[PDB]
Amino acid sequence: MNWKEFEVFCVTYLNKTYGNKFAKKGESDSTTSDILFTGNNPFYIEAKMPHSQCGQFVLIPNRAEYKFDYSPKNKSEINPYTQKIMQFMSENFSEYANLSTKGKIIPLPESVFVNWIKEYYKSKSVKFFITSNGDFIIFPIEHFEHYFNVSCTYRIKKSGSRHLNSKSLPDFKQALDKKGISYTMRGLELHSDENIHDKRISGDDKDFLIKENNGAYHVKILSNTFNANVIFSISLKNNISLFILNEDRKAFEAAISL
DNA sequence: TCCAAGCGCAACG
DNA sequence: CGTGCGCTGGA
Ligand SMILES: [Ca+2]
């Protein structure tokens, strides 16, 4: 299944096992998780597939000072583990200053990255993670290292898309005309009997992406921002201690009962 | 309202 | 197993 189906799978399990107290609804944002326990001891639960990413921060190369600057637009504050990563990269500036989409791994002790993850998720009121290796695994953030292997890389990650808007509609219609695609627009919704799912077309310094929705196509404008971020990858361990697993399930059962 | 940017997410070539 | 779109400050 994909990650969206996986998150629904996790929420459904929580509600059927522990009662209808686990919300995944409404708007989200990066300062919180996607699943909220709505009891007297509220907290967020992070669902992670066995192979996932697990947080990031943008660093800007300063080629005059030969160091990396923490982006003032990042959404989490510098903690000591952020500082260790930045210090390592800055002391090795030449090796990290040529940004790449392939990325360059950061060979610091895994505990530095685990500690960054713990700090970051604690700061977002994420107290537990849920994953699955065939059975559901729920554990508190303080025991993260017993469940996931962690690595860290610095890579260009292009920023995300935005919905086609009225201001861009003329350029998009003209891009369709240029590409020879037969179409009709109903507001910002695109209609065509051509097979244009995932189609990319460009015009007037905008790269457009076309995706099939219920009965029509939705149009997105892709980004032109190509900054680089430290970003964490996690892989579920094959050898999780059953003793830790059991005490961690009891920790969760305590947390939802306070 | 719109755009740049950062964080969400494993996806997929 | 070695790359970026969907979503959410300030002008
Ligand atoms: Ca990595």
mmCIF file of N, CA, C and O and ligand atoms in Angstrom, chain A residues 105 151-153 233, ligand 1:
data_model
loop_
_atom_site.group_PDB
_atom_site.id
_atom_site.type_symbol
_atom_site.label_atom_id
_atom_site.label_comp_id
_atom_site.label_asym_id
_atom_site.label_seq_id
_atom_site.Cartn_x
_atom_site.Cartn_y
_atom_site.Cartn_z
ATOM 1 N N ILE A 105 26.042 11.896 2.134
ATOM 2 C CA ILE A 105 25.754 11.402 3.469
ATOM 3 C C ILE A 105 26.643 12.104 4.483
ATOM 4 O O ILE A 105 27.752 12.566 4.172
ATOM 5 N N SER A 151 19.918 7.370 9.033
ATOM 6 C CA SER A 151 21.004 7.999 8.301
ATOM 7 C C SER A 151 20.601 9.429 7.966
ATOM 8 O O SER A 151 19.438 9.824 8.098
ATOM 9 N N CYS A 152 21.582 10.207 7.524
ATOM 10 C CA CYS A 152 21.401 11.637 7.328
ATOM 11 C C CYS A 152 22.160 12.063 6.084
ATOM 12 O O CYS A 152 23.326 11.703 5.917
ATOM 13 N N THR A 153 21.496 12.817 5.209
ATOM 14 C CA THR A 153 22.133 13.308 3.999
ATOM 15 C C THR A 153 21.782 14.772 3.791
ATOM 16 O O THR A 153 20.802 15.290 4.333
ATOM 17 N N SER A 233 16.683 9.799 7.008
ATOM 18 C CA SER A 233 16.031 8.599 6.516
ATOM 19 C C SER A 233 16.069 7.538 7.604
ATOM 20 O O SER A 233 17.047 7.433 8.352
HETATM 21 CA CA CA D 1 20.496 9.062 3.887
#
